[PDB]
Structure formats: structure tokens, C-alpha cells
């Protein structure tokens, strides 16, 4: 008989019929704007590639901070409101160092991502006055690293959820990249061909030419600790497209 | 004609009714089917892992809580993980103070109170996750299921999550012969109950079933992937 | 005092590593000594016996 406006996506802590926090899954809608990131976790190691999307030549490429070192054995990729990524990464680094301090050991990747998720999920509890978010974060993360269980990769999005994923792409073209991934991905991947295939997909989903400055990627494998790729090695691996 | 009353949890509808709680129920219907039947000696939790992503390891339904208490979540992952931490804290404190395993039937009441507190204050949302608690204590197995309405029930078998009505019907049709079952038959019944929820085109593979058992002498042990082959094998076709 | 030292350099190492993570450059010896001194300045005359 009658149709009415009915707003349940405005305030946090509000359940729509079908029982879902629209407010949080709007923060999921925010990742759709950040740069595309690819993480491939092979038995030989794990690599993290990401487009950088420089706006103007006057911008220093090294300033754009899309892959960070949580510790010597955890690498992270950002996508979304990097203003939030800066506090999440700070939490991750502080937690890893606290764990190493208390427990004379290297913190496993799963526990790192679990602690970072613990920083999330404090969306609305403003009765707890000190320094809450009052909102979900706006960033989706890709924790890559090596630990007792071999190399592992984890994806977490602004819902406090993680999975021991591998070949998970996040960013504006995340689902198209994932569609390419599953049919390109394989269990027995040498780290070289993992980087190869990842850069091929990142190629097709780009704006600009692909060169050493448009993207930048890092790998961790049991051999060496966290390792960025320089302008040198980026050109060195893109000679062959 | 009730749009003004279904926004905050501290607003009674002019029908004697809190719409927000009833909307918190609807989160449980968005998880995945999970079954918690029990026998005279043991209690089990069969849950179906989410095949919603691909190529990524499925989520982790069954959660360790203590040596004698285990849980299965069928709601918001945030609230589930927030409640499991509180459960672990309660059990740890109980063993610290009285040096005894915390009885299940009191931990469940503590859950009820803690989940009721937000239901009444402004600026909070009900805990949108439904639990399935398998435990053993001085009085044998128990299966308690929790709702976002801060209302806990004592169940001889229950299923919560998507399409769980099929599993509930099946369990209701086979509740009598649950008390006298060896562990094998109990797990087979639970697997069948979980099976009657799925579409007939797919069968319970080893990569989406997460049996976890506690009982008299068995600690709460979670059986992840391929390790659930012994339980899953021998399961007849529909 | 062995425990007081061991603990305070352990925490100083934690802080140095956090700094190196954030600012991407190794912390200078002058900075680390001041960190440790400030950390131990609190608890003045509370019983510490550090001689680092």
C-alpha cells in the first residue's frame, strides 16, 4: 500500500533487517577506492605487489608508503584510507616488539594479524571514553611473512576478520584481479614466476605504463628477511614484461 | 508504520517489542549451519566452514575456550571473537581462584548477563553472534546455545545459522537415539544433520567441516581439515 | 645490578628497534643513551642499581 524512507545505514550500531551493520560494510565500500594490491604466498616465499598511482611528477615516489616492514619477517600492503593504515601499522610494529620483548622469540604472522584485528572491532563503544575510533577503519591489509609454519599470507578488512589467504587481491580492481588470479595461481610456484604472474595481472589492471616507478613490490622468504625491490631490480624484472 | 521505533535499542515499539533485538537475530541467519548434538558421555560441534571466498582457507568456526568448554560461532565475527576472549578470561580466572574447571552452566549465565547489558543502554548494539557451547563438567555433557537477545537455552541438540531449520527438523526426528551412541555414531549423526542443510548438489568435503569433540575423558579437541577424514568417511549418500 | 640492567637494556633495545622501524634509520648512540637515562631518571632513588 505505502512506500517509506527507512534509514539504517546512517548511525553505527544499527542492524538493518537481514541483520547486517550497513555502517561497517560501508567501510568495506571504501577499499574500492585505494590502489590495487596483490599478494601471492608460495611455498618458496611470498611476494606483495601494489600499484602506487603517482599523481604528479613533482611527487617523490619514495614518499608514497604502500608496503611497510612490520618486522624483519612480516611485510604489509595497504589499500584505502592510508591515514588509518598509519595507526594500524604502528599497532602492528608495537605489538611485534612487545611480544619479542616479553617472549624471546619472533612473533608469528597469524598472531600479528590477530592483534591488528584486535585494534579493529572497537567501532562504537563511546561509553569507553579514551581515544576510540567511533567508526570502522578504512583500510584493507595484506600481512605477508614467514614463521614456524612456513610462509603465510593474511588478509584483513575493516571488519576485524582474517583468513590464512593466498592470492588475495585488494583495491579498486580487486575482484577482476582475483578472477585473473585463481586461474593463474598454482601451488608449486617458484617465487620468480609468482612475481611474473602478479606483475602481469597488475599490468592489465593499471592506468599508466608499467615501469619501476609506477609500482613497487617486496618479498620475504626463509633466506633473507624483509626485502624491498629497488628501481634497479624493478627494471631488472620488468625487462621481460 | 513503525519506522520511528526500529532504530535504537532503547525504544520500545508501540506493540511491546524491541525491533533492534529482532534485527540482531537476523545476524545469526547470515552465518553458516552448525550443529551441536550430544550423547550421554560426549558432546560434539559439527560446523560447516564458509565456502564464500575461493583459494583462501575457510574461516574458523570452532574455537577452543578451555580444556572442557568449546564454542561454535554463527554470527558477526567481531562479536564472536569479542565474546570468546571474555569466555577465556572467565575460565582462566575460575581455574586461578578455585582451582577447578568452571562449570558450563555458570559460564553460560555469565554470558547471558554480559550480553544483556548492552541491550538496554543507549549507543550500543546487541552482540550479533549466536554461540554453540559444548562442555563437560561434573554433570556430564551440556549443549547451550546463545542468541543475540541475551537469552541462553539448554539444548540436547540445536543448529543455528543459514537454513538451520532443516537440521533442526532432522535432529528432532532423531533425538531419542542420541543418548546411547558411541563417538563414531554421534559424529555421523551430527554430520548428517549438517548435511541436510546443504543443497543436494554438494556433499560435505573434507575442506569445509570442522568437527570438535569434548566428553568424559577426551579434552575439547578441534579436528580441522584432512584430519576429519576418519569421522567423515563411511558417511552414506543421501 | 644484573636484573635491573638486563631489563632496562632489553626495553631500550625494543625502543631502538621501534624507532628504526618508524624513521627508517638506525638510531644514534647519543639518542639511545638519552632514552635510557630518561627511562631510569624516573625511579630516582627508588632502589635501581644500574651502571650501564
Amino acid at each position: 500500500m505505502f512506500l517509506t524512507r527507512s534509514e539504517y545505514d546512517r548511525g553505527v550500531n544499527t542492524f538493518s533487517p537481514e541483520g547486517r551493520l550497513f555502517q561497517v560494510e560501508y567501510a568495506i565500500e571504501a577499499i574500492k577506492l585505494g590502489s590495487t594490491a596483490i599478494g601471492i604466498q608460495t611455498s618458496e616465499g611470498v611476494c606483495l605487489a601494489v600499484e602506487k598511482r603517482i599523481t604528479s611528477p613533482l611527487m617523490e615516489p619514495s614518499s608514497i608508503e604502500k608496503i611497510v616492514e612490520i618486522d624483519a619477517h612480516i611485510g604489509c600492503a595497504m589499500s584505502g584510507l592510508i591515514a588509518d593504515a598509519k595507526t594500524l601499522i604502528d599497532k602492528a610494529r608495537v605489538e611485534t616488539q612487545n611480544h619479542w620483548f616479553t617472549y624471546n622469540e619472533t612473533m608469528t604472522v597469524e598472531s600479528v594479524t590477530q592483534a591488528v584485528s584486535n585494534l579493529a572491532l572497537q567501532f562504537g563503544e563511546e561509553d569507553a571514553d579514551p581515544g576510540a575510533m567511533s567508526r570502522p577503519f578504512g583500510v584493507a591489509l595484506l600481512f605477508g611473512g614467514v614463521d614456524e609454519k612456513g610462509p603465510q599470507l593474511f588478509h584483513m578488512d575493516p571488519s576485524g576478520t582474517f583468513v590464512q589467504c593466498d592470492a588475495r587481491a585488494i583495491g579498486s580492481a580487486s575482484e577482476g584481479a582475483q578472477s585473473s588470479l585463481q586461474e593463474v595461481y598454482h601451488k608449486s610456484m617458484t617465487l620468480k614466476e609468482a612475481i611474473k604472474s602478479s606483475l602481469i595481472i597488475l599490468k592489465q589492471v593499471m592506468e599508466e605504463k608499467l615501469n619501476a616507478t609506477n609500482i613497487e613490490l617486496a618479498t620475504v622468504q626463509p633466506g633473507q628477511n624483509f626485502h624491498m625491490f629497488t628501481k634497479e631490480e624493478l627494471e631488472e624484472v620488468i625487462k621481460d614484461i | 508504520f513503525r519506522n520511528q521505533y526500529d532504530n535504537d535499542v532503547t525504544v520500545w515499539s508501540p506493540q511491546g517489542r524491541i525491533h533492534q533485538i529482532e534485527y540482531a537475530m537476523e545476524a545469526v541467519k547470515q552465518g553458516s549451519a552448525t550443529v551441536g548434538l550430544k550423547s550421554k558421555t560426549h558432546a560434539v560441534l559439527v560446523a560447516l566452514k564458509r565456502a564464500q571466498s575461493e583459494l583462501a582457507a575457510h574461516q574458523k568456526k570452532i574455537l577452543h575456550v578451555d580444556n572442557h568448554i568449546g564454542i561454535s560461532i554463527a554470527g558477526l565475527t567481531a562479536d564472536a571473537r569479542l565474546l570468546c576472549n571474555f569466555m577465556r578470561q572467565e575460565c582462566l580466572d575460575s581455574r586461578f581462584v578455585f582451582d577447578r574447571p568452571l562449570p558450563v552452566s555458570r559460564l553460560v549465565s555469565l554470558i547471558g548477563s554480559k550480553t544483556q547489558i548492552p541491550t538496554q543502554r543507549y549507543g550500543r548494539r546487541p552482540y550479533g553472534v549466536g554461540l554453540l557451547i559444548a562442555g563437560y563438567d561434573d554433570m556430564g555433557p551440556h549443549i547451550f546455545q546463545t542468541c543475540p537477545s541475551a537469552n541462553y537455552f539448554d539444548c540436547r541438540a540445536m543448529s543455528i545459522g543459514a537454513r538451520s531449520q532443516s537440521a533442526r527438523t532432522y535432529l528432532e526426528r532423531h533425538m531419542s537415539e542420541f543418548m546411547e551412541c558411541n563417538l563414531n555414531e554421534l559424529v555421523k549423526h551430527g554430520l548428517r544433520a549438517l548435511r541436510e542443510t546443504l543443497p543436494a548438489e554438494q556433499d560435505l568435503t573434507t575442506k569445509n567441516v570442522s568437527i570438535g569433540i569434548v566428553g568424559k575423558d577426551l579434552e575439547f579437541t578441534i579436528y580441522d581439515d584432512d584430519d576429519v577424514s576418519p569421522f567423515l568417511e563411511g558417511l552414506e549418500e543421501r | 645490578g644484573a636484573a635491573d640492567c638486563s631489563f632496562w637494556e632489553r626495553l631500550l633495545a625494543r625502543q631502538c628497534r621501534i624507532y628504526e622501524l618508524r624513521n627508517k634509520e638506525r638510531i644514534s648512540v647519543a639518542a639511545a643513551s638519552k632514552l635510557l637515562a630518561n627511562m631510569v631518571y624516573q625511579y630516582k632513588g627508588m632502589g635501581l642499581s644500574m651502571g650501564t
Binding site: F101, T102 | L92, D93, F96, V97 | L11, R14, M39
Partner: peptide, 19 residues
């Protein structure tokens, strides 16, 4: 309950003869 050692008494964030 008096004090009833709550749990792990006090040990959180320790980072800043008779015994």
C-alpha cells in the same frame, strides 16, 4: 569476596635475601 586474586594478579604492560 574480599580481594580474591582476580586473574594473573598484575602483570599487564610491565614495560614502564628475603626477596
Amino acid at each position: 569476596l574480599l580481594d580474591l586474586g582476580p586473574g594473573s594478579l598484575s602483570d599487564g604492560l610491565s614495560l614502564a635475601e628475603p626477596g
